[PDB]
């Protein structure tokens, strides 16, 4: 301990010690000395290992990924790197000794403790533990789960505890498994990473790596079996409960979606014991299995660590007009874990993508399975619920698989994971335990997700990405002390020209190759020059409305001093949703589009919403990544399905006659909003007929042309515009769905969501019951508002119509102040603090009439 | 359930049922009927076993030794005595299913409950548990230890808890093991304790007793190993702590006879983890092993 933790200004001492051990370990010419040295070395290494574990358990893992890795622990790694083949063996034994008290269910209860943040306060605890004399001889005298899984949780639909200590031992076990994997990771490079790094270290060879790997696998089999058997049993119980939820009647009070002391407790216990006894023989067909997952935190830690090991091994293993062409392949968000596509030419568009079928189906906390359509030891599913039968089957399956270096230098070492299954790749296991994983990916994210590179964060939905979004956008905002100020009219024509001109004067007088990072974005209206946030929200709204209008533009050439008057955007296909209209493709138009891209970057940088509802292929291009056949469903679902039907017809026995009868050629009509007329998909395309054999090219070119070629210059302009404000790295987290939640927020005003973010303040002096009745009245009116009237309400209350898609979306929070009783006055809202103030109206009718009249007086003054 | 617990003034019904099962189990001259009857019988017996366990767990054991043995449970014993060779096998499986959630360390936490003193209040709890419809388809639309051992106890020298549920499952397991033993106890006298007691029961033979005993032993080996290994480990830790108490100096404040929040708790946990790691390789020569016995209530029952 003291040599490592307390020589806080030295390292040559430790190096000398290691050099001595290495020299004597190589003293082969002296009899017995070899074995003596090995015995000495091992006895030292176990002491090093204790010091290492104690330190590693105390120091809290930095949630920002940092190389703080304090020098005590760095020194430990140096020892293990220098003495590798021995270090591995002793580490197995420390790992084994740490897990058994939990794996047998024996361990002591303890109170909890905070992990230590500073190096100093981490180190001090170990001093008081190693500053000890032997006893003298006698003197000479947890984010909450979705409804499809809530029934499986003990939830509401210091003292010691056993579970504390069971969990912390699993936490500690994971560390050692990672470290063993890391050391196995160094082996191929070792003939370089010895001599280029450390004065002395043990020589080792391919033959030794084999035997180390043999040894390491064996020591993991018991904990592996224990993990696997419990996981299979859990996944089975979850999937069965879901199938029953589908087949059963939600009107019944015992349905999973619908749902005293001693006797209720004896009820709970008896329900559990009866469910246990039933489950063993599959006598459990028509009631939910009794289960809680919150106890299973220790298997969550162990599972996470055991994947770490296999994942590392896999990194050592890896080191047309066909329907198989990349255009037709499923894309980002669509390719499920270890899954194979429901083929879009065999499956209806309506069914292949329920989100592309129904665009308003997207929610922040919807399960990914909905939006893109629901998808040997691993091939057979977790069918049995019983624990015991799974364990027995696991062991039988394991029995099925049971039933200088010459040649390779270390750089050529070809390890893998091959036992328990013949090949494991982690995608398969993410396929097998899919629901257990997703549930852990909500419940345990704060804790098991804090492990370095914890596989739970890969199941991280919208909010995980948004947690990074605030940190990055606020970091980009706070690095600059220079504002953006825009003074504009409310008139559509003046608004567009003035906004774009001032953005060019701001952009061009700052370096045009550096992102427009700003401190604050401030907006003032002419004849209403109120300023800052709510005014700027009203502006983002109004400027978006100006671009989406079907009225003719003013001459955009006015923007160059800082006619192509076609409307800026149109709705392609049979969506309510927009793509840029190319107009006459003049530079003035592209200049305008490049400024519009800047507006997206600015709103996001400020965490402010921009109500511009762009199509998926447009957004993929803005993100700078590839567009596929599936995005043509987001261009035009009716045309995508008609071309799917055309492909189904190419698979019909009369395809040559049907394609002759349709009279199709490689030329397409464009609407006026796409530039008009008839355009050839390939040169001479009017004279080239579509046949059942060339149709795959025709459908490809049709889709590619309509999504990209028609708008390539507007798209090039807007993307440049976004990069003019924000750095490229910020795009890398996102698919179009995520970008939608951040840019547009929740367009659907979910009243329960708005309730949860709303606070009520009272200035009226009236009693809590009248206040609660008035609060009920208000929400019952907002519930009865049409979605438009709700959007107008939030626009009145905040100067933006969409709800932010989270608590993190609000800056500041929405609030309602109840003022003293008045039936004459209207409700009024300071949108620059997003706060509404309402009189205590004498009746629900007056509250409704006054509220609706206020939000429908759309001429809002910029308070 | 209802035939056994709620016919509180009759027994001939149950006897008729058993006589019918026995007759058909002896219908050897009819093809297939034999195996059909065995399958039927087993499926009935597991239901009897659930009814029996539920009742046995609720009724508090009378601390004055009394033959109150309320008639529901007496009837259960009558069934198992009449169908002995089959009853034994199904009882093994119920025992096995009850212990595994504890023996793997998995089981749910629960609040505690009082065992029921009266027959009536014991019986009522089972009614509300068996008065149930399947879910419909979607419509068409502790005296304190002496000083030589006190150091080994977590002591001072409703909410749910894991340990409650771990303990009560062990309590429940013991009942079934006793009942299996009792039935094995009847076997020698059976050629008298059938015909002198009950209108009908299964014929059985020495060869069958052998095979039953083989089966019963196998089903106990896992829990036996688990019990033995923990007990040996515990006894070792206790005896070593005593030997050290003899050789050491009681003047030292760390002697077993002589003896802040978060950091003290992290102290306790680290002392435990360090004692665990030391103990694995006999690197533990001069400090007391960190231990508490109060958790081990489930191995005590087993």
Tab-separated table of C-alpha atoms in Angstrom, chain A residues 43 46 50 53-54 58 93-94 96-98 101 103-114 116 121-122 125 129 134-139 154 160 162-163 165 168-169 226 230 244-250 252 254-256 262 265-266 268-272 274 276-278 280-281 283 286 290-292 295-296 298 387 391, chain B residues 43 46 50 53-54 58 93-94 96-98 100-114 116 121-122 125 129 134-139 154 160 162-163 165 168-169 226 230 244-250 252 254-256 262 265-266 268-272 274 276-278 280-281 283 286 290-292 295-296 298:
chain	number	residue	atom	x	y	z
A	43	UNK	CA	2.515	-13.572	-2.973
A	46	UNK	CA	-2.159	-10.706	-4.479
A	50	UNK	CA	-6.030	-5.961	-2.855
A	53	UNK	CA	-9.459	-3.201	-5.810
A	54	UNK	CA	-9.813	-1.068	-2.661
A	58	UNK	CA	-13.693	4.008	-3.675
A	93	UNK	CA	-8.962	-15.558	-8.223
A	94	UNK	CA	-9.762	-12.121	-6.760
A	96	UNK	CA	-13.981	-15.351	-8.055
A	97	UNK	CA	-13.635	-14.600	-4.321
A	98	UNK	CA	-15.659	-11.370	-4.656
A	101	UNK	CA	-21.090	-14.625	-1.345
A	103	UNK	CA	-23.971	-15.916	-6.168
A	104	UNK	CA	-24.890	-18.257	-3.236
A	105	UNK	CA	-27.254	-15.648	-1.696
A	106	UNK	CA	-25.283	-15.514	1.618
A	107	UNK	CA	-23.827	-11.968	1.854
A	108	UNK	CA	-24.123	-9.620	4.909
A	109	UNK	CA	-26.433	-6.555	4.943
A	110	UNK	CA	-24.791	-3.115	5.096
A	111	UNK	CA	-25.780	0.545	4.940
A	112	UNK	CA	-24.980	2.383	1.628
A	113	UNK	CA	-22.067	4.755	0.943
A	114	UNK	CA	-21.190	7.538	-1.547
A	116	UNK	CA	-15.517	9.382	-3.294
A	121	UNK	CA	-10.869	11.617	0.082
A	122	UNK	CA	-10.730	8.358	-1.872
A	125	UNK	CA	-10.190	5.688	3.525
A	129	UNK	CA	-7.665	0.291	6.531
A	134	UNK	CA	-1.826	-7.795	14.135
A	135	UNK	CA	-3.421	-8.685	17.506
A	136	UNK	CA	-0.632	-9.168	20.144
A	137	UNK	CA	-0.080	-12.458	22.018
A	138	UNK	CA	-1.130	-12.706	25.664
A	139	UNK	CA	1.581	-11.000	27.821
A	154	UNK	CA	-42.676	-3.259	-7.568
A	160	UNK	CA	-28.546	-1.650	6.449
A	162	UNK	CA	-28.974	-7.030	2.029
A	163	UNK	CA	-29.469	-5.625	-1.472
A	165	UNK	CA	-24.129	-5.213	-0.211
A	168	UNK	CA	-21.830	-3.269	-4.393
A	169	UNK	CA	-20.023	-6.635	-4.588
A	226	UNK	CA	-25.806	-18.291	-13.219
A	230	UNK	CA	-31.650	-16.101	-14.656
A	244	UNK	CA	-51.279	-12.135	-22.575
A	245	UNK	CA	-51.695	-8.333	-22.579
A	246	UNK	CA	-52.362	-8.553	-26.323
A	247	UNK	CA	-54.883	-11.448	-26.237
A	248	UNK	CA	-56.726	-10.440	-23.022
A	249	UNK	CA	-59.468	-7.837	-22.399
A	250	UNK	CA	-58.242	-4.425	-21.039
A	252	UNK	CA	-60.981	-6.508	-16.921
A	254	UNK	CA	-56.714	-7.673	-13.666
A	255	UNK	CA	-55.350	-6.784	-17.153
A	256	UNK	CA	-51.666	-5.624	-17.032
A	262	UNK	CA	-50.657	-8.221	7.532
A	265	UNK	CA	-48.744	-8.833	2.974
A	266	UNK	CA	-49.768	-12.482	3.440
A	268	UNK	CA	-48.586	-10.767	-1.599
A	269	UNK	CA	-46.497	-13.614	-0.194
A	270	UNK	CA	-49.117	-16.273	-1.025
A	271	UNK	CA	-49.619	-14.893	-4.556
A	272	UNK	CA	-45.851	-15.185	-4.961
A	274	UNK	CA	-48.531	-19.908	-5.663
A	276	UNK	CA	-43.744	-19.980	-8.052
A	277	UNK	CA	-45.311	-23.445	-7.624
A	278	UNK	CA	-47.477	-23.025	-10.759
A	280	UNK	CA	-42.491	-25.002	-12.444
A	281	UNK	CA	-44.805	-27.269	-14.520
A	283	UNK	CA	-49.531	-24.662	-14.969
A	286	UNK	CA	-54.187	-17.145	-17.457
A	290	UNK	CA	-45.590	-12.563	-10.027
A	291	UNK	CA	-42.271	-10.759	-10.541
A	292	UNK	CA	-40.173	-7.725	-9.608
A	295	UNK	CA	-33.888	-6.978	-6.995
A	296	UNK	CA	-31.951	-8.081	-10.108
A	298	UNK	CA	-26.604	-7.629	-9.303
A	387	UNK	CA	-35.355	-20.973	-13.336
A	391	UNK	CA	-30.405	-24.014	-15.575
B	43	UNK	CA	-52.582	-33.710	-12.194
B	46	UNK	CA	-50.356	-31.352	-7.524
B	50	UNK	CA	-50.953	-26.600	-3.377
B	53	UNK	CA	-49.039	-26.112	1.542
B	54	UNK	CA	-51.184	-22.952	1.616
B	58	UNK	CA	-51.014	-20.122	7.432
B	93	UNK	CA	-41.230	-31.417	-6.803
B	94	UNK	CA	-43.211	-28.945	-4.668
B	96	UNK	CA	-37.792	-28.258	-4.940
B	97	UNK	CA	-39.838	-25.422	-6.487
B	98	UNK	CA	-40.164	-23.648	-3.111
B	100	UNK	CA	-34.682	-22.511	-5.532
B	101	UNK	CA	-35.524	-18.734	-5.432
B	102	UNK	CA	-33.765	-18.592	-2.035
B	103	UNK	CA	-30.937	-21.036	-2.811
B	104	UNK	CA	-29.955	-18.854	-5.842
B	105	UNK	CA	-30.348	-15.608	-3.825
B	106	UNK	CA	-33.050	-14.214	-6.200
B	107	UNK	CA	-36.279	-13.988	-4.133
B	108	UNK	CA	-38.559	-10.880	-3.864
B	109	UNK	CA	-38.713	-8.697	-0.712
B	110	UNK	CA	-41.983	-8.672	1.255
B	111	UNK	CA	-43.374	-7.265	4.491
B	112	UNK	CA	-43.836	-9.796	7.384
B	113	UNK	CA	-47.088	-11.439	8.526
B	114	UNK	CA	-48.454	-13.152	11.674
B	116	UNK	CA	-53.008	-17.371	11.992
B	121	UNK	CA	-58.903	-16.980	10.235
B	122	UNK	CA	-56.371	-19.389	8.737
B	125	UNK	CA	-57.141	-16.276	3.612
B	129	UNK	CA	-56.867	-16.864	-3.029
B	134	UNK	CA	-59.061	-16.599	-15.375
B	135	UNK	CA	-58.607	-13.309	-17.290
B	136	UNK	CA	-61.291	-13.075	-20.069
B	137	UNK	CA	-60.426	-12.816	-23.787
B	138	UNK	CA	-60.844	-9.474	-25.554
B	139	UNK	CA	-64.587	-9.000	-26.371
B	154	UNK	CA	-24.408	-7.761	14.313
B	160	UNK	CA	-40.631	-5.036	2.993
B	162	UNK	CA	-35.544	-9.536	1.393
B	163	UNK	CA	-34.746	-11.552	4.518
B	165	UNK	CA	-39.300	-13.652	2.251
B	168	UNK	CA	-40.590	-17.710	5.154
B	169	UNK	CA	-39.836	-19.794	2.037
B	226	UNK	CA	-25.657	-25.936	-0.199
B	230	UNK	CA	-22.214	-23.005	4.334
B	244	UNK	CA	-7.525	-16.385	18.623
B	245	UNK	CA	-9.468	-15.167	21.685
B	246	UNK	CA	-7.502	-17.689	23.759
B	247	UNK	CA	-4.003	-16.868	22.402
B	248	UNK	CA	-4.434	-13.061	22.108
B	249	UNK	CA	-4.219	-10.291	24.748
B	250	UNK	CA	-7.609	-9.105	26.193
B	252	UNK	CA	-5.896	-4.872	23.373
B	254	UNK	CA	-9.467	-5.218	19.214
B	255	UNK	CA	-9.712	-8.461	21.274
B	256	UNK	CA	-13.098	-10.256	20.781
B	262	UNK	CA	-21.202	7.237	5.291
B	265	UNK	CA	-20.559	2.446	6.573
B	266	UNK	CA	-17.835	2.470	3.895
B	268	UNK	CA	-17.877	-1.625	7.485
B	269	UNK	CA	-18.213	-2.523	3.806
B	270	UNK	CA	-14.452	-2.285	3.152
B	271	UNK	CA	-13.625	-4.328	6.278
B	272	UNK	CA	-16.023	-6.947	4.924
B	274	UNK	CA	-11.050	-7.104	2.642
B	276	UNK	CA	-13.593	-11.785	2.156
B	277	UNK	CA	-10.573	-11.417	-0.167
B	278	UNK	CA	-8.123	-12.418	2.607
B	280	UNK	CA	-9.942	-17.169	0.213
B	281	UNK	CA	-6.181	-17.960	0.416
B	283	UNK	CA	-4.148	-14.830	4.340
B	286	UNK	CA	-4.325	-12.043	13.089
B	290	UNK	CA	-15.923	-10.295	9.549
B	291	UNK	CA	-19.195	-12.193	10.018
B	292	UNK	CA	-22.838	-11.949	11.091
B	295	UNK	CA	-28.759	-13.493	8.018
B	296	UNK	CA	-28.378	-17.299	8.148
B	298	UNK	CA	-32.793	-19.740	6.151
